[PDB]
Structure formats: C-alpha cells, structure tokens
Design a protein around this motif. Sequence first.
Motif, mmCIF file in Angstrom:
data_model
loop_
_atom_site.group_PDB
_atom_site.id
_atom_site.type_symbol
_atom_site.label_atom_id
_atom_site.label_comp_id
_atom_site.label_asym_id
_atom_site.label_seq_id
_atom_site.Cartn_x
_atom_site.Cartn_y
_atom_site.Cartn_z
ATOM 1 N N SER A 14 0.836 -1.195 0.000
ATOM 2 C CA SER A 14 0.000 0.000 0.000
ATOM 3 C C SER A 14 0.878 1.255 0.000
ATOM 4 N N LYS A 78 -6.209 -2.111 -1.842
ATOM 5 C CA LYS A 78 -6.782 -0.808 -1.501
ATOM 6 C C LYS A 78 -8.029 -0.981 -0.637
ATOM 7 N N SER A 87 -5.832 3.611 5.325
ATOM 8 C CA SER A 87 -5.428 3.953 3.974
ATOM 9 C C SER A 87 -4.028 4.559 3.867
#
Length: 273
Positions: A14, A78, A87
Amino acid sequence: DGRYSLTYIYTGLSKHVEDVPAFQALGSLNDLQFFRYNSKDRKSQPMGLWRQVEGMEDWKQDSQLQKAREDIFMETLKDIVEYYNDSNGSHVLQGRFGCEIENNRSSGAFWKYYYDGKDYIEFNKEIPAWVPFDPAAQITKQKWEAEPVYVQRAKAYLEEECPATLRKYLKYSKNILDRQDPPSVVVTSHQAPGEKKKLKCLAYDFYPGKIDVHWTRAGEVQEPELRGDVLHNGNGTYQSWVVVAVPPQDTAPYSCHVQHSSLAQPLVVPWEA
Ligand SMILES: *[C@@H]1O[C@H](CO)[C@@H](O[C@@H]2O[C@H](CO)[C@@H](O[C@@H]3O[C@H](CO[C@H]4O[C@H](CO)[C@@H](O)[C@H](O)[C@@H]4O[C@@H]4O[C@H](CO)[C@@H](O)[C@H](O)[C@H]4NC(C)=O)[C@@H](O)[C@H](O[C@H]4O[C@H](CO)[C@@H](O)[C@H](O)[C@@H]4O[C@@H]4O[C@H](CO)[C@@H](O)[C@H](O)[C@H]4NC(C)=O)[C@@H]3O)[C@H](O)[C@H]2NC(C)=O)[C@H](O)[C@H]1NC(C)=O
Ligand SMILES: *[C@@H]1O[C@H](CO)[C@@H](O)[C@H](O)[C@H]1NC(C)=O
Ligand SMILES: *[C@@H]1O[C@H](CO)[C@@H](O)[C@H](O)[C@H]1NC(C)=O
C-alpha cells in the motif's frame, strides 16, 4: 512422468519507497523461477535458464496480462486497507496460486491470499468458492462471488487453464527441470586458538536440490554444528555445506559423504589432516 508445478506469487504494498516497486510478480516451475514482472518496468521478463528459451511465451502479450492483474490485485489491497481504516499505512497483500501435475495427470492446485502475513482468503475449487479467514475477507468473498459465473471461472483456471499452460511450458522446459548435474565437493577447515577445529564440506553446482551431505568420524556419522544450503536461480544450481567441530585431541579420521540422485555411488572426500 514425474511431478511438475507451476507457481505464481504476487506481492503488493500500500505504501512503498521509490526504488521499491509497489507490485511484484514471479513465476516458478518446480524449484526454479522462470519469470518476473514489477509495477515499475511493467515488463514480463524470463529468468535463469529460460532467458535463452524462445517461443515458450509471448513476453509482450504477457506483460499486458500482468498489467491487468496488477490493477486488480492492487485495488483489492486498496479496499482491504480501507476496511481497517488505515489507507495511509504500510500494508501488504500477497497472492499465491498455481497447479501441479503428476504422471501427466492434474494432481492439485491452489489459490490463496495473505494480508499482512495473515491468511486472508483462499479458494476451494471443490465447492467451488472462496474461504474467508479475516473479517474483511467476508466482504471480499461477497464481491468475488457476486455473479454465479465468477466461482466457475476460478475453478476453470485452476483445473483447466493453469495445467494447460504448465503442459506447454513443459514442452520447452522438461530438460531444465530434469537435469541431473552432479555436485562437486570440497573440504575446508577453520581453526581459531582456543576453539575446536571446524571442518566444512561443500557440495555445489548440483541439481536437483535433494542431497545428503554429512561428516563421519572414523565411520560414525557426525551431527553437524552448522548446516546451510542455497539455490542460485539464474544458474539453476544448488550448494549445500556442513560444518563439524572436531575436538582438540581427536585423531579419528574425518570424511565427508555426499549422496545425490545424479550419483550412482556416494561420493566420499576424506580430510587429509
Ligand atoms: C552458478 O552460479 C554460482 C553462483 O552464482 C557459481 O558459484 C561459484 O561456483 C564455483 C564452482 O563452479 C566456485 O569456484 C571455486 O572453485 C574452487 C576450486 O577451483 C577449481 O575449479 C576452478 C574452475 O571451476 C579452476 O579454475 C581451479 O583451478 C580449480 O581447479 C581444481 O584445481 C585443483 C588443484 O589443486 C585440482 O586438484 C582439481 O581437480 C581442480 N578441479 C577442477 C574442477 O578443475 C573451490 O575450491 C572454491 O571453494 C570455495 O568455497 C570454500 C569454502 O567456502 C572456500 O574456502 C574457497 O575459498 C571458495 O570460496 C569462494 O571464495 C570467493 C572469494 O572469496 C567467494 O566470493 C565465494 O562466495 C566462495 N565460494 C563459495 C562456494 O563459498 C569454489 O568452489 C565459486 O566459489 C562459486 N562462487 C559463488 C559465489 O558461489 C557457480 O560456479 C555457477 N555454476 C554454473 C554451472 O554456472
Ligand atoms: C472504521 O472506522 C469506522 C468509523 O470510525 C468504524 O465504525 C469501523 O468499525 C472501522 N472499521 C473497522 C473494520 O474496524
Ligand atoms: C499429457 O496429457 C495430455 C492430455 O491427456 C496429452 O495431450 C499429452 O499427450 C500428454 N503428454 C504426454 C507426454 O503423454
């Protein structure tokens, strides 16, 4: 014939640093890696012994296939990250899938994902359906089985497509995978004052990896103080070594014994004190 396996490993981050590509893919046939691909170069490149193999695969066209998978794999990562409200944190999603045949007959297959090292979701083609392990995997399971079709496709890939692809690569790879390259063995020594002498035996340039390397003291097998082995992929060869500590006064002869499939007779190298 024997056992042959086709394996793929996808790894997504990520958050990653600039050098480090966000997505990385790699495929293997048995113990060897035949190709790679990363989100930076976006190119499917052959590896090791396959670097010289032509016609096995259309690397240009595959590069497009990976680019596709990438987009999808990363998006999943995601979503998951969104679920746990992080996130902007460092997380990893790893996918592993493939098939294997034994005696020209499909003998298995698998498809599993790992979120941050933990088991996330896994596909059971016998159901067929996905198995969740992580709470979020439930949501993902949901989406992935949105249409009756999906599960069918998945089952197809593992039971049909994958093995088919394995079949074709075999036409171009059997040789590589079947090699019987005998090991060269070398005995070495180390001796620090106030320490037991250490004898090291090294078997190398061999393939397959399965090997037996052990020391003997006057004919009795000696438990190693240290073991170690490596695979050099670009090369296709292995290296395995073993170290024994010999007591100060010991006069018993020490010999290294190496057994390997490529050898008709065990290879014995004595240590000329
Ligand atoms: C695949 O890719 C591999 C990694 O990418 C690559 O690894 C390298 O493998 C080679 C062997 O293939 C290995 O070479 C060294 O060879 C020593 C013996 O030399 C022989 O053979 C060479 C050529 O093969 C000749 O030029 C020499 O003259 C010599 O010939 C022998 O001569 C005697 C005379 O006394 C005759 O009696 C013999 O009959 C005759 N034999 C032959 C066949 O001709 C070998 O002893 C070396 O041992 C190494 O390990 C010992 C214990 O760890 C160390 O004590 C010793 O110093 C050596 O250490 C290496 O040292 C380097 C520099 O410090 C390190 O960077 C290395 O990491 C370290 N290697 C190891 C394995 O520890 C040794 O086998 C290379 O050492 C090895 N290098 C690495 C990084 O792995 C493969 O070659 C590739 N194979 C293929 C098929 O593509
Ligand atoms: C994410 O945050 C929301 C709002 O604070 C919270 O209701 C929810 O439980 C969190 N999601 C997860 C999966 O923990
Ligand atoms: C492998 O199996 C397929 C399907 O049965 C067949 O087409 C092929 O000839 C087999 N390969 C060998 C070497 O028998």
